[PDB]
Amino acid sequence: DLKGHSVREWVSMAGPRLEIHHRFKNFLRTHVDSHGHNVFKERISDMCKENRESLVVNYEDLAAREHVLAYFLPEAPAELLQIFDEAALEVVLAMYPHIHVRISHLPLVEELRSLRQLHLNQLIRTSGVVTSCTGVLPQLSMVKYNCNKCNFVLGPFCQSSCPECQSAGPFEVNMEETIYQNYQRIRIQESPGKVAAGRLPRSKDAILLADLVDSCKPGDEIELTGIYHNNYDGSGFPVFATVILANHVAKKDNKVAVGELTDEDVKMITSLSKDQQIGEKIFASIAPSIYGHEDIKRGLALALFGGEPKNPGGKHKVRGDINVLLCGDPGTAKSQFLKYIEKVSSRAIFTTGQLTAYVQRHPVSREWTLEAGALVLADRGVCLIDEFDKMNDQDRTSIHEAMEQQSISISKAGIVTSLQARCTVIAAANPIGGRYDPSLTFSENVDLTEPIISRFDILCVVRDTVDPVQDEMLARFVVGSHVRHHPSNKGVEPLPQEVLKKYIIYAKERVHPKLNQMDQDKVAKMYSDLRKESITVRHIESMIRMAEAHARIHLRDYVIEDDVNMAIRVMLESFIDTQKFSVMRSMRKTFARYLSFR
Amino acid sequence: EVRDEVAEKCQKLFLDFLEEFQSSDGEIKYLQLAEELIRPERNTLVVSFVDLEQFNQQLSTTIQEEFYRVYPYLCRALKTFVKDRKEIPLAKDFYVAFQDLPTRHKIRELTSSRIGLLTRISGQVVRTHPVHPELVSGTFLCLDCQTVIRDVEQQFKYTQPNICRNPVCANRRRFLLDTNKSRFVDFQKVRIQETQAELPRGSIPRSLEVILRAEAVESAQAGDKCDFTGTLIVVPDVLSYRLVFLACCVAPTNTAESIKNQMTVKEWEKVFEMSQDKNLYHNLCTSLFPTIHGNDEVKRGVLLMLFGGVPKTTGEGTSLRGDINVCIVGDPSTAKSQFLKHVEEFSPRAVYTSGKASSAAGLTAAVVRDEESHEFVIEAGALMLADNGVCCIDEFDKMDVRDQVAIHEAMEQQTISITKAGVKATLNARTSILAAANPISGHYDRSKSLKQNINLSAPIMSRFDLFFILVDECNEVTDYAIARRIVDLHSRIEESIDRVYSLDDIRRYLLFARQFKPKISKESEDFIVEQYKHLRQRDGKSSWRITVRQLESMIRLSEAMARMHCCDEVQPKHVKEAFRLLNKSIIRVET
Amino acid sequence: MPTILSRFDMIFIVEIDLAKLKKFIAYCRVKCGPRLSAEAAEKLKNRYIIMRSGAPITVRQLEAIVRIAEALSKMKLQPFATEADVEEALRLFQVSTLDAALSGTLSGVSQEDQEMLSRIEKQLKRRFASEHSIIKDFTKQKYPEHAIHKVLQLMLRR
Ligand SMILES: Nc1ncnc2c1ncn2[C@@H]1O[C@H](COP(=O)(O)OP(=O)(O)OP(=O)(O)O)[C@@H](O)[C@H]1O
Ligand SMILES: Nc1ncnc2c1ncn2[C@@H]1O[C@H](COP(=O)(O)OP(=O)(O)OP(=O)(O)O)[C@@H](O)[C@H]1O
Ligand SMILES: [Mg+2]
Ligand SMILES: [Mg+2]
């Protein structure tokens, strides 16, 4: 029955083994649930409709109906899993002359850093983000060779001179064992935003055999349930590498569905949104550790709020994300902005130009695997790339393609697929020559080609001007920061960072602006004016995206009167900031009215 | 069923010590330590060797003599002690870590006679291998007689059962490993070498492999100096054997009040006089650089680098650099390499290297395949070896682009994140860098900007606190003085130096001064503000512009100068002197 | 390995009872062996000239087409092969040959392939005159791994 001496030994016993098998088989019929629809019959019918030999079993049902059985599942995963597999196979044959059973809804979920030897050789469910995946490797076979003229068996040799007598004979196979008759190897790391900053994210390797093969793509956040057990690996004797034998996989839709907030905080967020001035406060809180660069703060707030992606459909999709590029002379604290947005925005990653994805032969073994780059890893998040001006030519082409499509199609050896990355790029780089040249324009004084520049909603220039009062304020700020942080030490008002993050999440996931009304006359007249002055529809789409973002900042439904004005102001200011000195002056003079509209 | 009376007696006495020994408070400290150990990720408990020695000298002597023999029984005692006490997981590995061992042997002294006995060694990590689970107590089943062989301990090799379990059956060749039932433990292979302190001159260091397990697996990162308490053991290698130091505990190698109490009366009196010695700045510069003439500013900057500023970490997890970086761009000869050699020779923890080094590490941490194991290993480079020290890099202008970007990242973030071949690590490197370089074409064109004179990338130049330009003056007096210095040195083989302070005295004074962390007074704050106002107003033409990076370098130099006199607060004197130094280091175009 | 692909007559990229089918197959195979009729042969000859002019097709492919036409005629147990039979055989071979164009896209083991191999030769001569790094770089340069290996082997032979 139960309460033996060891759970593994107890299940191994034939008596209790068949007892549990019969009990599970009976449960395969009794459990009609309160609905009375014969849940197991429905599952069998669904499986046999497509003959998927994949059964889904909810741990809650087993625990409630049986209790003891579900309790023993964690301690003896393989045995009870085989029992359930044989029971399901027998049931399917009876109804429709191998069946794999996949469990889910495990009560406790452990992070990668949360699992240790206490969880070795047990079933567990974790939440991670895929990073790399290989093909459907055929098989891993361990071959042990009986020695030629000596009482000894050569150590296991992996596949996919005697240590004592030094016999030169070819030897004969004493024992060959097959493992992973058809398997795919993936790597899952801690989901971005759950890492403790300095700590390097944990990574683990999962093997999906037969069932679940190719059920995931690099860059996909998945809740993976499986047996975390030691096992051989492709490498005297073979190295024993701990892995997770995948039993069930899932997909976390939208890559963010926490919904974790305090209703009081939500009400406060809405009330502040009703308060118009809060928008200015948001700007003020973009860079608490910086002084000046208010325009950069507004641009970064716009990027954080991104925009509602409109989808024309087959032709294309309007990428609601706002791509920003910060360029300027050194000492402008661009990297400080990147670090700020990284630490604030959830589901964001940071990297340097010295990305996308690529297939390479995993050096640890001889196996081609696709690796998920920064862009795909971010997916529905934020990607920060510093030193963006320093990248490989292949990297430049790939990032151009990704920004043009928000998805990269890979057609490498034995791997053809497409990885989707709806990632908001906040990239930064430096001029070509360090110092910024007022005469040469943005596309000239920076070592970036025009195809990349085109796919950037906002381009901003940071100039280290020699101004006395502002420099004095900067000196005061930096001295204060240094003194207050000594190790022996221990306009509108800003917004607390926590509440700002709550606002970002809530607005980004709830409010989605629209275009019920139309000021198309004003927009078209402005575009014609710009053409008469210099502009392309790319500017128009960027303008509408940032207008949607600004509306989201105030949780507006369709649009506010100043929304289009703010979008035009931002676009025009950037466009002027990316011109020559004489051209910049001419544009400023011509557009003085539009800029003064504010 | 054979009972080792020594092992059982040691287990009994160890359990008694755990459950009776108490701190000065009268309570069992180890009870609370284990209570802390119940938490996940805490499977190793530290034990003070001196404490158990006081509790039972015979027990300590036996453990020292036969540490390896009794260690499993100590672990069993810990398991029994923790299991019955609180709600600890019924079955997870536990270990005992020993510390406070007075006997500190040298890697030279590790002889086969010391195999199996506890000992503490001090070394510097060189390379670190990936973690790997390894079977310790395997379980097998005989294929013919289908009987489960259990607890067939393996001595660090794939040791199958000698013969079947059943006397009836004698398969002896077809045992099947039960992975699930097998007991595994996580091992990491590290390599360590003799620390430069113990290294004899011109002698190749001894490389010793060590095994880390349990809490110690990730404790030691590549390039750092650490002390390991463990036991030397033998491991068979393809009756060949090789030595490996299985380390139970790993600790970092070795306050102002603590140092002063430890310091001798005469040494403390000398240091106190040094602190009270006015004009100690120039005196110490001249003492530290006898075989040099002129270049007083270079010596000042090098000394300030030797002292270093106060590192600061913000509340937002941002690290503000505390140490400074110096570069010396000089015409052919002019004693640049001499400056670097003097700095390396004087200061322990200072490592000299050249930008032409072809080592796989390449002046920074790298990932390389082991020739034998063929597994990628994180090999520490010279820059890592200079951890919390100084890296005197010569031929800095000739560095490779790979090493150039690595060094840029290191000096920017003070840490190197190395990821490749599936291996990943984040090695801390807080190292002051003293670089030597030559102008493009060999001779410095004072009518050209510094950028045009050197090939270093803009980020590298920006992240350097001070640049010192050494131009070969044609003045007859300077050449005459240089000849005088060199000839006097070569003739008066010794005694030509005039050291107002001895090298050991300077070393101990530097160690004492390091303990201070000078603060900035509001007067100092406004003085710094005004000095930066003047520096910005200068706005010239200068070789390289002036940015907030220069302000950071200024405040770091001011902190270092405050540390010079050991005063705990900044004064306008330090700020003004630092401003003078940095402003003078600026060179204007002479066109 | 790839040389074998040249000797395959046909290459494709992804009622009657079994026993009765086997009996019919055996009967036809042992009884009727067709031959190409003058009209059918002339049609095939003209078609082959057209295919060569457009181009690739090789004489071995002409023999493969002839064998396919003979099989088609045998299906109907005809002593000779009608020009319509040649047309059906040509339809099958044209399926195989447009599939072969997209297989040259798949395999290309070819004027463009020769040109790109020459490019690899020039690049390697410029570079020199680890192995894994070299292979990875050339692969990143759109060069197929098989092409790189073939160039390396050829240069070793030289
Ligand atoms: N407006 C500002 N307010 C406060 N600190 C500032 C400001 N601008 C720059 N800084 C300071 O600049 C210092 C250096 O900036 P940082 O290293 O991030 O620059 P960077 O843009 O990455 O430079 P580079 O082009 O050299 O790589 C930061 O520590 C920050 O304190
Ligand atoms: N200003 C100086 N005062 C005293 N000695 C000097 C001076 N300049 C050069 N020397 C002497 O020059 C001798 C040779 O110089 P050294 O070999 O150290 O040059 P270096 O800095 O390595 O040159 P480089 O790197 O440009 O080749 C040194 O022994 C040093 O004594
Ligand atoms: Mg930067
Ligand atoms: Mg030299």
Ligand SMILES: [Zn+2]
């Ligand atoms: Zn043998």
Ligand SMILES: [Zn+2]
């Ligand atoms: Zn047997």
